[PDB]
């Protein structure tokens, strides 16, 4: 309700990463808590297309 734009963007970021991690782990049948490194290396070097 408070319409916190930077907070809202970061909320979208955190929820999308957690949802993606959970679906990837479930289809992957691996514990999500041990599935962050490939995501970090993909998103840290996320270029203009990515």
């Amino acid at each position: 309700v408070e319409e916190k734009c930077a907070l809202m963007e970061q909320v979208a970021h955190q929820t999308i990463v957690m949802q993606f991690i959970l679906e990837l782990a479930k289809s992957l049948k691996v514990d999500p808590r041990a599935c962050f490194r490939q995501f970090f290396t993909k998103i840290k070097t996320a270029d203009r297309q990515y």
Binding site: S27, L28, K29
Partner: protein
């Protein structure tokens, strides 16, 4: 998964298509048919497929007019 009709065929009863997010035929084949494949998880993830029919080859028309008669046939 899905079956539809499109504009890609002139003389083939049916053809097959891949998803918008999915490796094509040759890509999937070459990827899986190479050593150190590591198929444990990545193998069981890709290659979604669909289907299409041309409504021009009379074989499909006779098939449809046969299927409209019997709904549980054998052949």
């Amino acid at each position: 998964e899905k079956v539809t009709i499109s504009n890609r065929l002139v003389s083939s009863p049916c053809c097959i298509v891949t998803s918008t997010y999915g490796w094509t035929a040759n890509m999937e084949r070459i990827m899986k048919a190479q050593a150190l494949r590591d198929n444990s998880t990545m193998g069981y993830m890709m290659a979604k497929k669909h289907l299409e029919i041309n409504p021009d080859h009379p074989i499909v028309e006779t098939l449809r007019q046969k299927a409209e008669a019997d709904k549980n046939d054998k052949a």
